[PDB]
Amino acid sequence: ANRMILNETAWFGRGAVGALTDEVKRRGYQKALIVTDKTLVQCGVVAKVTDKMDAAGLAWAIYDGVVPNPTITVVKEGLGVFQNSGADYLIAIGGGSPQDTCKAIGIISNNPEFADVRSLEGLSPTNKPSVPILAIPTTAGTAAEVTINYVITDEEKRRKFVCVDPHDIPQVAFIDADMMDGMPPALKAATGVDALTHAIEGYITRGAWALTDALHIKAIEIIAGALRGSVAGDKDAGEEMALGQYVAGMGFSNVGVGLVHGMAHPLGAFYNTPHGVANAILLPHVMRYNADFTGEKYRDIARVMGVKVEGMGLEEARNAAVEAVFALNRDVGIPPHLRDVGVRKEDIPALAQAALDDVCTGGNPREATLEDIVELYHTAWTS
Amino acid sequence: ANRMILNETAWFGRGAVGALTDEVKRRGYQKALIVTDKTLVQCGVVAKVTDKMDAAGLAWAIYDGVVPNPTITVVKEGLGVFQNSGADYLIAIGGGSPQDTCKAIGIISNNPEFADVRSLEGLSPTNKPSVPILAIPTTAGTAAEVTINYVITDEEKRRKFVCVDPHDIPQVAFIDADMMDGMPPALKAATGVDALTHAIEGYITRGAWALTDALHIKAIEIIAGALRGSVAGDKDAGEEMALGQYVAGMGFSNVGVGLVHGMAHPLGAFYNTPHGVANAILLPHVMRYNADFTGEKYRDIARVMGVKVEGMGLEEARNAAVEAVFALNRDVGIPPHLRDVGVRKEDIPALAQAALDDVCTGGNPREATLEDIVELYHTAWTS
Ligand SMILES: NC(=O)C1=CN([C@@H]2O[C@H](COP(=O)(O)OP(=O)(O)OC[C@H]3O[C@@H](n4cnc5c(N)ncnc54)[C@H](O)[C@@H]3O)[C@@H](O)[C@H]2O)C=CC1
Ligand SMILES: NC(=O)C1=CN([C@@H]2O[C@H](COP(=O)(O)OP(=O)(O)OC[C@H]3O[C@@H](n4cnc5c(N)ncnc54)[C@H](O)[C@@H]3O)[C@@H](O)[C@H]2O)C=CC1
Ligand SMILES: [Fe+3]
Ligand SMILES: [Fe+3]
């Protein structure tokens, strides 16, 4: 039997954050800790929420120390602020980095045996639910608002570790493209192909079943249809991307992903490479490696990505699916090689071993050897 | 902005009730009240749950007084049992009738100013969440396990009233076809076409949007694909039906239905007509009425029900959707006319006023008049 964890409540559309003050009053919460980053404060995205809270007379404090690929140190800093704030709930404003930091703070506040942070890795044996979290994404992006995962960087051990825990699921998600419009086009592109990686890896993962298949192929269709338009600055395409990224999460949270995520995590740990850019570069290479273990699923992918599949045999449709991803990466200006974003040739053996050991790698439909991964890194390295 | 309420936790597949004892221990609950009907106790369906609970040492009491189209009296009697039981949670075992009774008991128990039951009608102004509900459907299905609605019969006033409350959402749904195999074929047929009615009405409802459209069209594809096989007693078809009826609820709970539900409720109240039979008989007649107000949606319906729409103009595709529902109804042995199920011609004026005043009617893509509804009851009445 298959489990699904989802948000009990989610609001979708431009103006969705408009529902937040009423959700807070109905729940009877007294004071928020807002978990975010300095950029979101600096650009006025956090004010879009706090101005509404002030108008409704709701108490809040703020922690804005979150950095990309958030570290054990960032979690402990935000824990200290939460525990000294007297807040009874959390509001996560931002991408994967603040949302994952917020999940770690909420879990530890109600489960103090785990306050060292690294002991949360894997299926966290938590006794108690998280401090309640209201989750507000600002990237079109990670679906952290709907997943049971969070990823923290262990700086001492040079590794990203995955914490999987139904106790961390947000009580409410607010998916509001008004919070996302300020993303630079390069960030829309990187978070957009991250969402596409989620959708494609989830579609072909080993745990895949009828319900996740239906969410994944819809997510692929929405994202492939909208990403070029959203990068270009189309307001409607931005609204489509906000939904697409979420629908992908509803699936992959519950069944898993594969080798793209497994290979992208070590790049994050070694070089602080943005998650989206690493995923985007690796995706078409990993799809080519997986092609023969995906049944007819690349023909569905090719179709929803606008390839004419009427005539094509399955082998041509598989190759056309991979070429559709190459062409999308080109079109939204993702760098084509790992060397371009600060990877070292010398590191690939260590990267390959960290990828083989990464939990995400287990979901890959083709059994990955150390030797295959080494070769996959070399292929994405350069011409 | 559009809201979605869903189950936070759901288990799917034959054996899913296997997960119940672990879920209870992790939540720390001390004592269940099981809400069910005498048929489900007698047939050994409730024993599929209680034998696992007895083996794990989990305490339970039972209220088995639920009747089809549950009444104010069934709610008040169940409430009395829950209060005297010392139970701290509810397990709903059955179709829409016990699941709707269980929602009512759980709400009133934590919001005792509603113990009259009548005052719950509409958007219930409840301050507290329901007593925690674990929901186990035995039909395929009303999707009551994942909706925020419950329907009670007021005997004194000869009317079914709809209670809509996010506070009533079950904490866990267990969707296990092993709990549904014992349905007689005629019960599989009627609850199956009720699920189809949910999916088709939800697909074309005024409030419809991108996410509910994706859920509803997948539900129609699954249900139209499986129902004949399930009624005929195919094991896999039964498992597909369990999933399809649920996916239908994920959508229609959040956006609404239409005139089929509006015209079915008064038949329930006047004659105690089974909900699924009334919907099955009315569905194709209301689809024919609505056809011009559904854009290209009947082409999608016709395609996923196995009609070859490639050549067809829109008028042939719309007719093809209607005829495919008439054909499914005949194939699974649903009676074609309301006269066959105990409706009286004399009552049609009173039924039509009840239907026009029903909350579900407001969702219909075509604005219904009293005269249009009278004409629709006559058309479904006889040859
Ligand atoms: N929880 C899960 O299941 C998953 C976790 N992740 C994690 O999420 C992280 C990546 O998160 P992302 O959302 O890609 O980025 P991020 O949260 O790391 O932010 C990247 C940068 O964009 C800025 N930014 C974000 N929204 C902005 C906006 N609206 N306008 C202007 N600037 C904005 C941020 O301040 C930051 O400098 C990684 O640590 C990754 O491992 C990724 C996917 C799955
Ligand atoms: N809450 C909601 O969103 C919705 C509410 N409803 C309500 O649900 C009710 C209809 O519920 P249904 O599930 O159609 O029927 P039901 O729960 O009224 O059951 C009909 C009969 O079938 C029997 N039965 C149930 N499961 C069985 C099994 N596995 N084996 C043998 N017999 C079995 C029951 O004992 C009963 O005698 C109506 O009151 C309707 O208004 C219907 C749809 C949506
Ligand atoms: Fe990712
Ligand atoms: Fe119904």
Side-chain angles (χ1 to χ4, degrees):
Chain A
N2 297 296
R3 197 188 54 194
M4 297 290 292
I5 310 298
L6 296 175
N7 299 295
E8 198 175 82
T9 310
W11 287 93
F12 301 83
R14 294 185 174 282
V17 300
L20 184 132
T21 56
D22 290 353
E23 289 291 345
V24 172
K25 290 170 199 286
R26 279 193 219 94
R27 281 149 207 275
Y29 305 150
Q30 297 294 298
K31 181 179 182 176
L33 195 85
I34 297 166
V35 176
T36 197
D37 72 41
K38 284 171 196 318
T39 311
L40 295 175
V41 171
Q42 192 85 3
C43 296
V45 176
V46 171
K48 292 188 204 279
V49 171
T50 59
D51 291 353
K52 286 192 216 309
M53 293 187 68
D54 298 328
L58 303 181
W60 57 271
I62 190 167
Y63 171 70
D64 62 17
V66 173
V67 301
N69 304 130
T71 59
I72 290 170
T73 296
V74 162
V75 170
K76 291 205 254 192
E77 200 168 85
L79 181 57
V81 181
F82 181 77
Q83 299 284 21
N84 289 283
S85 73
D88 54 357
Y89 77 113
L90 292 156
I91 305 167
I93 307 171
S97 296
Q99 292 221 72
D100 285 4
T101 299
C102 196
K103 287 180 171 159
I105 295 168
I107 286 290
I108 295 171
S109 301
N110 281 345
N111 301 278
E113 55 260 61
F114 296 97
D116 59 279
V117 189
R118 42 165 70 81
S119 51
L120 291 166
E121 176 172 10
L123 296 168
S124 334
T126 54
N127 189 232
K128 290 297 176 178
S130 179
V131 163
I133 298 164
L134 278 48
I136 312 173
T138 70
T139 69
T142 64
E145 60 273 14
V146 70
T147 74
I148 61 167
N149 318 141
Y150 54 106
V151 181
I152 306 306
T153 302
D154 190 332
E155 282 184 287
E156 205 162 292
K157 293 178 203 277
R158 205 136 177 273
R159 55 192 296 278
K160 271 162 88 68
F161 59 97
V162 185
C163 315
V164 181
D165 194 348
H167 277 154
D168 72 29
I169 189 73
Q171 300 291 96
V172 195
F174 305 87
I175 307 95
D176 187 342
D178 294 346
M179 303 292 288
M180 302 175 171
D181 284 329
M183 279 191 279
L187 180 61
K188 287 184 181 183
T191 69
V193 178
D194 188 35
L196 187 70
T197 307
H198 285 154
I200 291 170
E201 286 217 295
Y203 196 47
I204 68 176
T205 204
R206 284 184 317 104
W209 64 280
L211 178 55
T212 69
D213 283 355
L215 296 169
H216 286 317
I217 195 67
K218 179 53 53 177
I220 296 177
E221 181 174 36
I222 295 171
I223 293 162
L227 188 45
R228 289 177 181 81
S230 185
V231 169
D234 184 68
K235 136 195 164 68
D236 280 353
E239 193 160 9
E240 296 175 345
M241 280 307 305
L243 176 65
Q245 64 93 34
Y246 185 92
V247 171
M250 296 178 87
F252 85 76
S253 178
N254 292 116
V255 294
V257 285
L259 184 60
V260 180
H261 274 79
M263 287 180 71
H265 280 158
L267 298 182
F270 277 51
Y271 311 119
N272 211 16
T273 322
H275 185 71
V277 173
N279 275 321
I281 294 170
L282 289 162
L283 173 56
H285 302 285
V286 174
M287 278 169 69
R288 176 166 289 156
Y289 174 79
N290 287 335
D292 291 358
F293 304 71
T294 61
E296 294 187 350
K297 284 180 176 186
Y298 281 22
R299 191 167 173 281
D300 311 336
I301 294 167
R303 196 183 73 252
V304 296
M305 293 190 67
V307 176
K308 314 287 202 167
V309 300
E310 302 100 78
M312 297 187 169
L314 175 55
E315 190 51 29
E316 200 192 342
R318 277 169 178 174
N319 298 323
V322 164
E323 185 47 46
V325 173
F326 273 123
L328 178 61
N329 285 355
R330 273 195 295 281
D331 282 357
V332 300
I334 307 305
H337 304 117
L338 288 179
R339 199 185 81 153
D340 300 339
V341 296
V343 176
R344 300 166 52 211
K345 214 200 320 188
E346 286 77 10
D347 284 324
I348 285 175
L351 289 173
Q353 181 59 49
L356 192 73
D357 287 333
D358 192 278
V359 294
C360 297
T361 290
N364 200 71
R366 179 173 178 182
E367 182 144 34
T369 71
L370 182 68
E371 297 58 58
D372 295 320
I373 297 171
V374 160
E375 166 74 332
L376 276 162
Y377 276 130
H378 275 278
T379 318
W381 164 251
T382 211
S383 308
Chain B
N2 295 300
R3 188 187 62 190
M4 297 288 294
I5 311 278
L6 294 175
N7 297 301
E8 192 175 64
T9 312
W11 290 93
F12 302 81
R14 297 181 175 282
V17 303
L20 185 138
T21 57
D22 281 345
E23 284 294 346
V24 168
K25 307 217 155 151
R26 270 177 291 183
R27 288 158 198 279
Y29 305 144
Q30 294 305 284
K31 214 253 185 123
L33 182 71
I34 294 170
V35 178
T36 196
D37 63 44
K38 286 184 293 291
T39 298
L40 294 166
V41 177
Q42 289 178 356
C43 288
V45 172
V46 169
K48 292 177 215 259
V49 168
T50 54
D51 289 356
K52 298 164 196 271
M53 289 182 75
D54 290 346
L58 301 184
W60 58 270
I62 184 164
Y63 169 63
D64 65 351
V66 178
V67 307
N69 304 128
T71 69
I72 289 174
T73 302
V74 161
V75 171
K76 290 191 182 184
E77 175 180 277
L79 179 60
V81 177
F82 180 82
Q83 284 167 332
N84 298 344
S85 64
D88 57 357
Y89 75 110
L90 290 156
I91 306 168
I93 304 182
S97 293
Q99 291 202 71
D100 281 7
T101 303
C102 193
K103 278 180 201 172
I105 289 167
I107 291 287
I108 299 169
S109 182
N110 278 353
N111 303 273
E113 65 257 61
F114 295 103
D116 66 290
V117 188
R118 295 207 162 82
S119 44
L120 290 166
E121 183 166 355
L123 298 176
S124 313
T126 54
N127 289 133
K128 299 303 179 196
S130 177
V131 169
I133 299 166
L134 275 51
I136 314 178
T138 67
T139 68
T142 61
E145 64 268 13
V146 69
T147 75
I148 62 169
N149 322 131
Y150 53 103
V151 182
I152 312 303
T153 296
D154 190 335
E155 289 197 287
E156 182 252 318
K157 302 217 271 202
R158 219 178 173 212
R159 63 193 292 270
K160 279 164 78 76
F161 59 101
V162 178
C163 309
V164 180
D165 190 347
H167 278 148
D168 68 34
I169 185 77
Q171 300 301 103
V172 196
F174 305 86
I175 303 89
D176 187 341
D178 294 351
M179 300 295 291
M180 297 166 184
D181 286 327
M183 277 192 280
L187 184 61
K188 291 180 168 176
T191 68
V193 174
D194 182 34
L196 185 64
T197 296
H198 290 153
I200 296 188
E201 288 218 290
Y203 193 53
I204 69 181
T205 195
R206 279 185 187 269
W209 62 285
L211 176 60
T212 69
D213 280 357
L215 294 171
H216 287 312
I217 198 61
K218 179 55 50 170
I220 297 165
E221 187 178 21
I222 292 164
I223 293 167
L227 183 49
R228 286 185 189 79
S230 186
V231 167
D234 181 65
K235 202 176 72 73
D236 290 351
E239 201 175 9
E240 294 171 8
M241 275 311 301
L243 177 54
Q245 62 91 35
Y246 183 94
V247 173
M250 291 172 74
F252 87 76
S253 185
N254 290 121
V255 292
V257 284
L259 185 50
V260 182
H261 274 73
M263 285 174 76
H265 281 160
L267 295 182
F270 276 47
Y271 306 121
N272 211 27
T273 313
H275 185 71
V277 168
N279 283 320
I281 294 172
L282 290 164
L283 172 57
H285 296 288
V286 174
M287 285 178 69
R288 185 168 275 160
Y289 174 77
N290 282 340
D292 268 309
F293 295 71
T294 61
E296 291 273 329
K297 292 203 160 168
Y298 283 20
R299 189 188 290 285
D300 303 323
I301 294 173
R303 178 160 28 243
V304 305
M305 293 193 73
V307 172
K308 308 286 199 195
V309 297
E310 203 200 336
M312 293 187 181
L314 182 55
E315 277 303 302
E316 201 180 0
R318 284 171 171 184
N319 193 239
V322 172
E323 286 304 340
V325 173
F326 277 127
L328 180 62
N329 280 353
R330 281 192 294 279
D331 289 358
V332 300
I334 278 147
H337 304 112
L338 290 182
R339 195 181 81 146
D340 302 326
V341 305
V343 174
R344 302 195 314 168
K345 276 220 317 303
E346 294 69 25
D347 293 329
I348 282 173
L351 287 166
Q353 184 60 55
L356 184 67
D357 290 344
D358 189 275
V359 167
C360 303
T361 298
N364 200 65
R366 185 176 171 175
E367 190 161 18
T369 66
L370 177 58
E371 293 69 27
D372 287 4
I373 298 173
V374 163
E375 186 49 51
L376 277 174
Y377 275 129
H378 278 283
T379 314
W381 158 254
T382 205
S383 317

